[PDB]
Assembly symmetry: D3
Homo-oligomer: 117 residues x 6
C-alpha cells in the first residue's frame, strides 16, 4: 500500500478509520457542547480523509484490470464508498458513517476473494 510496491494491503486500514468516523458521530449525538462539537468535527474530518485515502490506494494500487473485469461493479462500489465518506464528513448522523462502513464491507469481501486466487 506504500507503492514500492510492498505487496501488503488490507481494507482494515480503511475500515478502522471509518469506524472512528462513525464512533465520533455517535459521540456527537450525546454531547452538544460547542467546543466538543468543534473538536469532533475536526477529527472526524481527518479520519474520513484517511479512510478515503486507504480506499483510493486499494483502487489504484492493489486492484488490477483482471479484477475490474471479474467484478464489473468494483469501480462504482469504491467510488460510492469514498463519496459516502465525504457525506459522512458533512454529517453528524451515524447513518452516514454506517453507509460508508457497509460499502467498505463489500469492498473487503471482494478484496479477500481476489486474495484466494
Amino acid at each position: 500500500h506504500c507503492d514500492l510496491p510492498c505487496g501488503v494491503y488490507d481494507p482494515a486500514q480503511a475500515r478502522i478509520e471509518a469506524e472512528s468516523v462513525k464512533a465520533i458521530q455517535e459521540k456527537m449525538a450525546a454531547n452538544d457542547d460547542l467546543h466538543f462539537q468543534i473538536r469532533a468535527t475536526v477529527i472526524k474530518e481527518q479520519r474520513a480523509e484517511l479512510a478515503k485515502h486507504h480506499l483510493d490506494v486499494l483502487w489504484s494500487d492493489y486492484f488490477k484490470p483482471p479484477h475490474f473485469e471479474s467484478y464489473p461493479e468494483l469501480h462504482t462500489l469504491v467510488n460510492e464508498a469514498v463519496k459516502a465518506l465525504s457525506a459522512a464528513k458533512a454529517s453528524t448522523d451515524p447513518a452516514t458513517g454506517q453507509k460508508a462502513l457497509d460499502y467498505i464491507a463489500q469492498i473487503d469481501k471482494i478484496f479477500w476473494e481476489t486474495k484466494k486466487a
Copy 2:
C-alpha cells in the same frame, strides 16, 4: 477539491506535479551523480504521489454519477492514469512521465467538457 466542498477543481494541479516528474527524469538521465540520483528519486516519488492524489480527488469528489454514465470509460481512464504515475515512480525513463502526462491530458478534456455541459 478540499471536500467542503468548495466548488473549485482543476486538472492543472495534477499536470504541474506530473510535469515535475518528467522534468526530474530528464535531469536524471543527464546527471549520474549518486547523491543527485538519490535526491531525484525521492522527490520524483513525492511529486508523483501528489499527482495521484490530485487525480484521486477529481475521481472521488468532482466527477458525479451522471459523469461516469456520460463517459463510461472515465473509471478506467483515471485508473490507468494513476497506475501510469506509479510506473513513473519506478522508472527514470522520461517516457513514463510523458505517458502519465498524456492520460492527464485526456482527463482534462473530459473535465472541461463536464464543466461546459
Copy 3:
C-alpha cells in the same frame, strides 16, 4: 517547486488554493448552520495555509537575486500576499480572500515576465 530543483513553477498553484479560500467565504455567507461553519473554517484554514506555502516556495526557490534586483517591490509584494492570506484565515468576509487573489495576480504577472525573459 520541489526544491530539487525541478525547474517547474507556476503561481497557479497558489491561485487555485486562494480561489477556494474566497469561494468558501462566499458560501459561509449563505449558510449559517453551525457544523457547516465549523467545516468551512477548518477547510479554509488549510487551503489558505497551502496557498501561503506555494507563495513561500516561489519566493525562496524560484525568484533569485537578479529578479529582486529587477523588481525591487517583489519582497514586499510577496510578504503582503502571504499576510493577506493570514487575514483571510481569520475572516469570513470574501473581500479578504479577494485581496490575497489580487496580490497573487500581481505576483503571477511578474512571474511570467521573468519566464519570457
Copy 4:
C-alpha cells in the same frame, strides 16, 4: 486513536505497517538495482515511522494507569518495540523487521486482554 478520543484502537494499524517494513527488506535482498534500493529505503523509512506512531498512540492514549500497574513491563515493552522499528529503518536485514513484529505481537496480546477485561 484520533485523540478525541473516539474509543477506536487496534494494534493492527501498527502491525500492518510493520509487515510492510519486513516485506520491503525481503524484496531488497532480491533486487540490487540502485533506484529500487533507493525507493525501497525511502518507503521503508515511512512505513516504519507510521508503525512507531501507531504504537506511540496506544501507549499515550489507550493504555491507562491501571494497565501499566497490571502490566509493569508494558512501558518497557512498547518502548523496546518502537526502538526495534528504529533499528529496522537503519537495516535491510528482514530479521530486524521480524523483531518489531514479535514485539507488536506481545503488545497485541496484552491489548485484547485489557479489552476482554
Copy 5:
C-alpha cells in the same frame, strides 16, 4: 530527533508547542466570537499534537534503557505529560496548558542531567 539518528535533541521543541497551547487557551477566554473559537480550537489541537509528538520522540529515540533505570519515574512522567496535553486539547482552561508545561519542565531537567552526565 529525525531518527537517522542525527544526535540532535531538545525538549525545547515540545515546550514551544506547549506554550502556544496555553497562550491560545488564554486568548480564547478573551474572545467569545464563534469563528475565533473555532480557529483557536483547531490550532490548539494541532499545537498540542506536535508537543505530544516531540515528547514521544524523546521517549522512544533519545532516552535509552539505562535512563529509565536511572530515573524509575521517567516512563510515568512522559506518559503523564502526553496525557496532560490530550487534556489540554479538550479544554479551554489555561490551567490544563500549564499542567502540561510543568511536566515538560521536569522532563527537561532530567534531559539535561542525562546530557551533562
Copy 6:
C-alpha cells in the same frame, strides 16, 4: 507561529533543524555505505525543509512592516537563509550546513532585538 496568531515564536525552531542538517552532513563524510547515504540524504532533506518552513513563518507571520523598515536588509537576509538551506539539501559538505546556521544566527539576533523594542 501557528497563524492564529498565538504570539509564540522562536528562531530556535529553525536552528535545531539546521543543526541536524549539519550533523547529518558530517556523518555522511565518515560513512560511505550506500544505504546509510540514502537514509542520510532522505532525512537531511526533511530537516532542511522544516528549517526553511520555520524561517518562512517568521518572515510571513512574525516580522511586520515596521521591522522591515527598521532592518532594510531583513528581506534579503531571510531569503539568503532559505537559499542556503536549499543548497545544504543538495550538498554533503558540512560547510553548506554551517552557512545556513550562520544566517539563522543573524536572523535570531534581529529577532530578539525586535523583542526588546
